[PDB]
DNA sequence: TTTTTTTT
């Protein structure tokens, strides 16, 4: 009649929960009967209803515990340990293979019985995106492969172009795809130390909107970024490890993650420019805005923001062999759903609408 | 029956594992039945497959205990305590001898060749590197003398040159073939005095670029570097037994570690001297880029970053007595393994190709 | 049947260890069966081999204990507490005996089984050092008892002299013998707050040359320092206690320490002169520098700044009566070495060599 | 058999010791056999020898304790509470009675059989100080009573005079007679805030060398202090509580304590002048200087600075009843002691001799 | 047997003590037998002699506890909890009624059998304050109502007049009567952030000496405060909640307290003029000056600053029904005491002769 | 004890 710390640790592992407060909160819900658990009846949250009946009996005794935070602490530690072990041992290809498996599990329930998504809407987003730039999907693949190999001195891509020209809109989807974080280099010289400290164990980073000093004749305000990146040239090249730091915790040391920069059409040092591998200079395209005006439901649902939209685009455009073996099994299934669910001229109609600037559906 | 904290502390000692999170993660892998273990079968990481057979019985009991992080702390303490003893009592030679042996062991896998690389790559590595500097081999040797003799005045070497000159990559490689840490000091020091616990218990530290107080008036970005160096002219001259402030990181009293100062072509007030072996020049020189461009495996496999790519240079030339008195058979074996495998006139291919600025493998 | 904490504390006292990782690491070395202990076989370190045989059985139980760092923390407190009892109750004369043991114990290493450096170079120092000043050894013993009696007003000697006159050099050797700190007063006034705050709690100090507004008559850089200096009478004469301070931190309130002033030959008021016991007018002088510029191995060993070479000089020159009575029984053992090893012609030759301006070793 | 924490608490109380480390160290000394205790034999510190025999039995078992520091921590907590109770509840006259009982204890040592200094030599100082200002002893009793009553506005005394007028000497002795702190207000308006925080919970403050304005018309260097004081009228007046601040801490509210001001002959605004209850000028006096020249032991033993000297003077001159009733019993025996140890003729002979400017003794 | 932690929790709740060392220190006093406790026999401190016999045995056991500070922390946190509860739940009228009860209790000691003050001197005090303004009691009654309603906009009062006019005297008395804190907005704009953190949870605040600018046309120094107050509009109007900040604590939110602004007769922006309900002008009145000269016990005993005198003014003047419902019983009884102690004739005679500036008492 | 506040 005592806490199975083991059963608690199973749940924290299986959910990948890594906040002690969230773990505590979630586990407590299992104290009441699953038998009439209205959340289970709603099938509302899988992280709840998948587990409640199994964990109920343990959670009933957990509710009486006087140690509760300590039990959750050791549970969370086990989840963090797995993250650390993986970060040292796995190849980046395998890390990314796992990241696909996570998102593909999420795409189960979104389209399952709960199913609250509409697959039509999400593919309108792909059609809008794929219309954005020539040969769109191939560019995503090239970024991902570069990110996988992590070729030293060849780690960063330049996105350039006017305000609202969609570079952030693209980038947000890429970041959700890989997992990673965003940071700002418009800050006072190398005073950014604890913000660059964010990048510990991250797979990818993205920097927003370098305020290129001197562009303001063209209404482009100046700022720190250009020369902060003139400074961080080792972080650009990645040819060395560095320290990074966070509070009431040890330092940590690693290669710095590869990433993306976004900027307006400020000038740039040709040398700093030569530290980037590649550019994408975005331009406004009115018909996409007119399309959006008539297609509000996308943004209400953040569809074009979402890495889930990119994944559907690759499942659409790419051969099955283009991805790691085990997920090819899943990718095959995700061909099947598209094959079944769309007539090809459905996508034609949709992308045809996008180009005509009508609402994507009609 | 009981968890044996002893058996855990053995594993920490033997792996030389040195973070509670890494250690905790590792040991929990053993809790599955060894006889079946897929990682043992797969032979993926020796830090597991060498040990799972032995520790499995104990890990079963470890997995149940309600205080797991405490065991890992005591075990990590033992590994760090071992390092702190040797941090005092060793001759400078035996420290460097320790550092070397592990590279030989890694080379045993690499070139006893259950590990992967083609030594031809790293011979080509030595070609690219050894071409960089007049008498580079002696430069490495002369550094090691200055290090192993801990020499006052001579305690620092000043790398002056443009960026992309390699000076930092060189310094970092000596942070491989020697232990040590990098450092930055270009700020008003008041609360920053707490940082150099990083330099406590170091044989060596490298001061990164002097972001000067004259600064961008030199076309080189500003900071507090030059004046801070001028101020701490006591410490650079080794005048002080280290009582710099901590940031949790605990105490080995020492003279401040020797090493390098680096400078992207900034100004210097002549007062800063009486305090080095010398200043040292560096330049980018296109043909070396021409070769690298034609040889970028040197960069992909990070050959040029490595201090492995300096160790191998030593083997190929020096009398074994210039190395440790004791280790001498190990180097003789590796000498033979490559003295057999090339004449100098073979990999003189690489030398003259690098000298010509042209690709360094066939 | 259990760890005796008592024996750990004895060892912690007898080592005078006061860092927890050091004590922990070392005491675990006693684990192995003492009879074969290879550190004992080699006689590596007495702090081991004088103890393992005694402590052995207890160290077995220690290694099996489940709270090791808690034992070590209490033992370290016992050692550091002893210092603070002594920090209260001891006279400056008894406190001076620390220096002598500190110096002699280090010197045992310096001429250890390693003969860590050839003691003959240290004696070649002792020779050259005595060459530098009229009645050099008496000039030291003058300063010694000057600093013992700490006599108010009668507290300070002015090291006057031109650039590169060895004043700082002798101060450095004196500061080696004695310890100290160095400070600057040419600073703007706001600095002195914390700058002088640095002087807090030290047995002796020096001031860097007072760059002073009139010296640039010579172009002696005309910092604020001399006008700044003649405000500070209460500190110098040590008549009355004074406040000191630290960044981010409180005042401290104490009698101001004694010590040394360097300067190059600015003008001064007799107002300032009266603060001093004494003045010394260094200059660079012929066969002293011109011997060293041959015998620069002593620059490389910095014996030219070695307070422990002053200690050998004292042991050579001075009556047994000149030293605190108990510790005379060590000094005799060093006298006996010097008598044999520097049989008189050895010493006489070395000094004579310097007196020929020619390499002190021949 | 258990440690008695109570005996440790009593020792911490009786020694009035409030550093956990100092307390710990001293209590350990008692574990060794009392009989042969060389500290006891040398009568080295009463804090030891007047206690070792009492505590020895408990100290031995305390030396076996596993938890030693917590015992000492609780003991220190006892003493700090006792201070804080007293600080909030005693009358000012009781606080001064405490200071006097304390000094009388130390004088029992100085002139006891241990005889650590000559009562002759200290009485030489009393004569010299009684000669420093007219009616010296009467002025001292006034000042003490003024601080004891602390009547609002009637709280501050002015010590104005040239350099080497001795005003610092008098202030030091008074501050030693009462306990208190010096302050500097030649700071700018920034630093004052933490400077005044020094005064927290003191009995006296002394303001040092307030540099006025325009003084170089009389060669006096000018500065902030006078103008700063005249803002602080409400701190001087002492009629309402003020907010006081320490670094890293919240503000505190209390009445600013009474005190003393020193300066050269600057002009004083009538506003500031009016807030002083007495002005006491000082003058240089040649016969004091020529007398003091020969009575060298006065400076070299710091007699004329010491509050022990002031306490002696009050005993020699004042009526018994003028003392608080508790110490009056001790005053009798000290008067009677001194009245044995000197005639009036002896004492008046010193005063006469000092007026002649000649070495004090014959 | 055991320590009753609950009896300590009573004693803290009883005494309202909320400092662990004051609580600790007092609780320890009781361990000696109250029967001979001289603090009891003296009845010197009510917080002792009321309680000693009651807590005797528990203190005797508490004196042997090994957990002493743990007991006290729990007790102290109980008292903090009560304040926190009341800080939310009470009305402003209850807070004022609570505050009045505290003062009445101290008055009953002061004028009790212990009688440590003379009610006639305190009544003499009341007369002088009545003469400071027209209709003084009506003014006080207006002020308190304005505070208790705390009506937005209508929250602040301005005191104005030349220096030595009584404004600070009245402010300090009103501040004692309600409780509150004083603040100095004349700082520069940065630390003013932390300055306002003092206002947290206060019933009331006072702004000192808000320095104008260009006041030197009126012989006044310029400053900063007024410009800062215009940057603080809504803090005064009390319409909206504000953020507040102490050192080393995360911010909190509340309506900023009502209060009083004080200045010498600078000019005011009409933007600032709009904040205030009312302003009161103070004129220097020499006959008060002459009265204080001849009535010194007023100042010396700090009568005229103390809120007790304002409460006496309220009791002697105001009709009973104006007081909060519960205390009307006590107030009636105190009026009855005052009518016993004085005829109106006597009070009228005091108020008369003050008007001619002769000393009060006759 | 850091981290924040102090420092700047
Ligand atoms: N190329 C485009 N043409 C027209 N409208 C666009 C384009 N790209 C994005 N939009 C619209 O502008 C909005 C903002 O786009 P986005 O933030 O990606 O632009 P941005 O140039 O990267 O801007 P910023 O630098 O401010 O982040 C989008 O949500 C979409 O509504
Ligand atoms: N001789 C060369 N000519 C041109 N490019 C070179 C040469 N040597 C190295 N490089 C390039 O410069 C890149 C950066 O080198 P590295 O950072 O070591 O230079 P550095 O001078 O030490 O720079 P910094 O001091 O600014 O960090 C290398 O990865 C390589 O691609
Ligand atoms: N008489 C001498 N014989 C040998 N070396 C000398 C002599 N005088 C000076 N030197 C050398 O001059 C160099 C500088 O000496 P040091 O720092 O003590 O001089 P300083 O006068 O204090 O310096 P500064 O020029 O800064 O005032 C040292 O190498 C010292 O050994
Ligand atoms: N009245 C005096 N007449 C002559 N010499 C004096 C007198 N008072 C002090 N001295 C000499 O001046 C020295 C300094 O004394 P002290 O610091 O007390 O003087 P001060 O005038 O108060 O100083 P400050 O200038 O620091 O205010 C004494 O040690 C003594 O040598
Ligand atoms: N009406 C008055 N007429 C003359 N003197 C007065 C008057 N009121 C107060 N005083 C005198 O002024 C002294 C100081 O009073 P108080 O501090 O309240 O003045 P203030 O003008 O408010 O000062 P500040 O503006 O400097 O804070 C009192 O102790 C008293 O001696």
DSSP collapsed to 3 states, D10-26: HHHHHHCCCCHHHHHHH
Please give the interface size between C and D, counted as residue pairs whose CB atoms are below 8 Å apart.
Answer: 65
Q: Is the dihedral of CA D29, D35, D36, D37 positive or negative?
A: positive
Distance CA B157, CA B280 (A): 7
Tell which residue, D90, D201, D9, has the closest CA to residue E28.
D9
Q: Which residues are CB-contacts of A283 (< 8 A; sequence separation ≥ 6)?
A: A161, A162, A165
Q: Which residues are CB-contacts of E171 (< 8 A; sequence separation ≥ 6)?
A: E159, E182, E206, E260, E262
Residue pair A209/A186 in contact (Cβ under 8 Å)? The answer is yes
Query: What DSSP string describes A25-59?
Result: HHHHHTTS-STT-HHHHHT--HHHHTTHHHHHHHH
Q: Do C182 and B151 touch (CB under 8 A)?
A: no
Q: Which nucleotides of F are covered by protein (CB under 7 A)?
A: 1-8
Q: Can you list the pairs that E77-85 forms with residues at least 24 positions away whose Cβ atoms lie under 8 Å?
A: E78/E9, E78/E12, E78/E13, E79/E12, E79/E13, E79/E16, E79/E17, E79/E18, E80/E18, E82/E13, E83/E18
The conformation of residue E181, written as its DSSP 8-state character, comes to E
Residue pair E318/E141 in contact (Cβ under 8 Å)? The answer is yes
Which tokens go with D138? 């009467």
Instruction: Report residue A259: phi and psi, to 5°.
Output: -175, -165
Residue pair E269/E230 in contact (Cβ under 8 Å)? The answer is yes
Distance CA C253, CA C258 (A): 16
B166 is in an annotated binding site: yes
Q: How was this structure determined?
A: cryo-EM
Tokens 């997992």 identify what position? A179
Alpha carbon E352 to its chain's center: 29
Residue pair E22/D81 in contact (Cβ under 8 Å)? The answer is yes
How far does B22 lie from chain A, in Å, by closest CA? 6
Element (H, E) at C107: helix C92-110
Length of chain B as a residue count: 362
Q: Which residue is nearest to nucleotide F1 (CA to C1')?
A: B248
Residue pair B247/B197 in contact (Cβ under 8 Å)? The answer is yes
Torsion of CA E268, E269, E270, E276, to 10 degrees: -50
3-state secondary structure of C208: coil
- Which of D22, D168, D221 has the CB atom closest to C84's CB atom? D22
Distance CA C238, CA C154 (A): 9
Pairing relationship of beta strands B181-183 and D252-254 according to DSSP bridges: unpaired
Instruction: Report residue D306: phi and psi, to 5°.
Output: -90, 135
Å: C192 CA to F7 C1': 15
Q: Is the dihedral of CA C219, C225, C227, C232 positive or negative?
A: negative
Please give the interface size between A and B, counted as residue pairs whose CB atoms are below 8 Å apart.
Answer: 60
* Helix, strand, coil percent content, chain B, rounded in steps of 5: 55, 5, 40
- Largest Cα separation within chain C, whole Å, is 80
Q: How many Cβ atoms sit within 10 Å of the Cβ of residue C134?
A: 6
Alpha helices per DSSP H over chain A: 5-15, 20-29, 38-42, 46-49, 52-62, 68-89, 92-109, 119-132, 136-149, 167-178, 193-196, 225-231, 233-237, 270-275, 286-293, 297-300, 307-317, 325-341, 344-356
Distance CA B128, CA B350 (A): 8
Tell which residue, A131, A121, A170, A135, has the closest CA to residue A360.
A121
Q: How many Cβ atoms sit within 10 Å of the Cβ of residue C76?
A: 21
Q: Do B84 and C22 touch (CB under 8 A)?
A: yes
Which residues on chain E are in Cβ contact (under 8 Å) with D251? 198
Pairing relationship of beta strands A259-263 and C249-255 according to DSSP bridges: unpaired
Question: Between chain E and chain B, are at least 3 CB pairs below 8 A?
Answer: no
Give the end-to-end CA distance of chain D in Å, rounded to a whole number: 64
Alpha carbon D31 to its chain's center: 35
Residue pair E139/E318 in contact (Cβ under 8 Å)? The answer is no
Å: C249 CA to F8 C1': 16
Element (H, E) at C58: helix C52-64
Q: Can you list the pairs that C323-329 forms with residues at least 24 positions away whose Cβ atoms lie under 8 Å?
A: C323/C100, C324/C93, C324/C96, C324/C97, C324/C100, C327/C97, C327/C100, C327/C101
Which tokens go with C127? 């020779």
Distance CA B83, CA B66 (A): 29
Distance CA E226, CA E247 (A): 25
Which residues on chain B are in Cβ contact (under 8 Å) with C26? 85
A220: left (phi over 0), alpha (psi -120 to 50) or beta: beta
Pairing relationship of beta strands A241-244 and B205-207 according to DSSP bridges: unpaired
Which tokens go with E143? 């002020």
Which tokens go with A215? 């562009």
The conformation of residue E356, written as its DSSP 8-state character, comes to T
Distance CA B241, CA B253 (A): 7
Q: How would you list the strands of the sheet with C259-263, edge to edge?
A: C182-183, C205-207, C259-263, C156-160, C278-281
**DSSP-assigned beta bridge partners for residue E183:** E207
Pairing relationship of beta strands E276-281 and E156-160 according to DSSP bridges: parallel
Q: Which residue is nearest to nucleotide F8 (CA to C1')?
A: B188
Note whether B9 contacts A: Cβ–Cβ < 8 A. Answer: no
Residue pair A59/A33 in contact (Cβ under 8 Å)? The answer is no
Distance CA B198, CA B239 (A): 19
- Which of A82, A152, A230 has the CB atom closest to B221's CB atom? A230
Which tokens go with A261? 């920069």
Give residue A256 CA to ligand 2 midpoint distance, Å. Answer: 18
Distance CA D205, CA D182 (A): 6
User: How many angstroms separate the Cα of E159 from the Cα of each of D332, E234, E238, E260?
Assistant: 57, 20, 19, 7
Residue pair A24/A6 in contact (Cβ under 8 Å)? The answer is no
The CB-side HSE value for B133 (13 A sphere, CA atoms) comes to 17
**Residues D291-325: b if buried by 16+ CB within 10 A, e if exposed:** bbeebebbbebbbbbbbbbbbbbbbbebeeeebbe
- Which of C63, C69, C300 has the CB atom closest to B6's CB atom? C63
Residue pair E5/E66 in contact (Cβ under 8 Å)? The answer is no
Instruction: Report residue B94: phi and psi, to 5°.
Output: -65, -30
Residue nearest to atom 26 of ligand 5 (CA): E163
User: Which of E127, E161, E164 gets mutated to test ligand 5 (max ligand atoms within 8 A of its CB)?
Assistant: E164
User: How many angstroms separate the Cα of A297 from the Cα of each of A304, A359, E11?
Assistant: 11, 10, 66
Q: Measured CA to C1', what is the nucleotide nearest C245? A: F6
Residue pair D71/D6 in contact (Cβ under 8 Å)? The answer is no
Find the residue in B nearest to C172 (Cα): B239
Which tokens go with D90? 């005693």
Residue pair E104/E334 in contact (Cβ under 8 Å)? The answer is yes
**Which chains does D contact via 3+ CB–CB distances below 8 A?**
C, E
Tell which residue, E198, E265, E259, has the closest CA to residue E229.
E259
Residue pair C87/C78 in contact (Cβ under 8 Å)? The answer is no
**Residues C255-273: b if buried by 16+ CB within 10 A, e if exposed:** ebbbbbbbbbebebeeebe
Query: What DSSP string describes C76-96?
Result: HHHHHHHHHHHHHH--HHHHH
- Residues of the binding site of A for ATP: 161-168
**DSSP-assigned beta bridge partners for residue B259:** B156, B205
The conformation of residue C212, written as its DSSP 8-state character, comes to B
Note whether B325 contacts C: Cβ–Cβ < 8 A. Answer: no
Alpha helices per DSSP H over chain E: 5-15, 20-29, 38-42, 46-49, 52-62, 68-89, 92-110, 119-132, 136-149, 167-178, 192-195, 225-230, 233-237, 270-273, 286-293, 297-300, 307-317, 328-341, 344-354
Length of chain E as a residue count: 362
Residue pair E183/E199 in contact (Cβ under 8 Å)? The answer is yes
Element (H, E) at D52: helix D52-64
Find the residue in E nearest to D250 (Cα): E247
Q: Which residues are CB-contacts of B9 (< 8 A; sequence separation ≥ 6)?
A: B74, B75, B78
**Which chains does E contact via 3+ CB–CB distances below 8 A?**
D
- Name the A residues in 153-172 with CB < 8 Å from any B CB: 153
Alpha carbon E186 to its chain's center: 23
Find the residue in C nearest to B13 (Cα): C25
Residue pair B327/B100 in contact (Cβ under 8 Å)? The answer is yes
């Amino acid at each position: 009649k005592q806490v199975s710390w083991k059963l608690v640790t199973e749940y924290a592992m299986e959910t990948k929960c890594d906040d002690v407060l969230l773990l505590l909160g979630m586990y407590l819900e299992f104290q009441y009967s699953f038998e009439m658990c209205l959340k289970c009846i709603k099938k509302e949250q899988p992280s709840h209803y998948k587990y409640h009946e199994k964990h109920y009996a343990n959670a009933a005794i957990f509710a009486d515990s006087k140690n509760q935070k300590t039990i959750c602490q050791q549970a969370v530690d086990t989840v963090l340990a797995k993250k650390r072990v993986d970060s040292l041992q796995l190849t980046r290809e395998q890390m990314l293979t796992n990241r696909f498996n996570d998102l593909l599990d999420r795409m189960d329930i979104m389209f399952g019985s709960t199913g609250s998504a509409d697959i039509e809407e999400w593919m309108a987003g792909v059609a809008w995106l794929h219309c954005l730039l020539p040969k769109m999907d191939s560019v995503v693949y090239d970024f991902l492969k570069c990110m996988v190999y992590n070729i030293p001195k060849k780690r960063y891509w330049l996105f350039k172009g006017p305000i609202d020209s969609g570079k952030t809109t693209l980038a947000a989807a890429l970041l959700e795809l890989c997992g990673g974080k965003a940071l700002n280099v418009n800050l006072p010289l190398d005073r950014l130390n604890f913000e660059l400290g964010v990048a510990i164990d991250q797979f990818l980073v993205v920097f927003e909107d370098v305020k290129g000093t001197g562009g303001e004749s063209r209404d482009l305000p100046s700022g720190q970024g250009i020369n902060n990146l003139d400074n961080l040239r080792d972080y650009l090249d990645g040819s060395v490890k560095v320290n990074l730091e966070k509070k009431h915790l040890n330092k940590r040391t690693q290669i710095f993650p590869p990433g993306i920069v976004t900027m307006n059409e400020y000038s740039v040092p040709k040398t700093l420019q030569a530290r980037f591998v590649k550019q994408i200079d975005f331009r406004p395209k009115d018909y996409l805005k007119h399309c959006l005006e008539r297609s509000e439901f996308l943004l209400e649902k953040r569809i074009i923001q979402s890495g889930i939209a990119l994944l559907l685009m690759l499942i659409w455009y790419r051969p099955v062999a283009e991805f790691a073996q085990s997920i090819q099994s899943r990718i095959v299934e995700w061909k099947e759903r598209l094959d079944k669910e769309f007539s090809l001229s459905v996508y034609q109609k949709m992308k045809f609408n996008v180009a005509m600037g009508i609402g994507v559906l009609d």
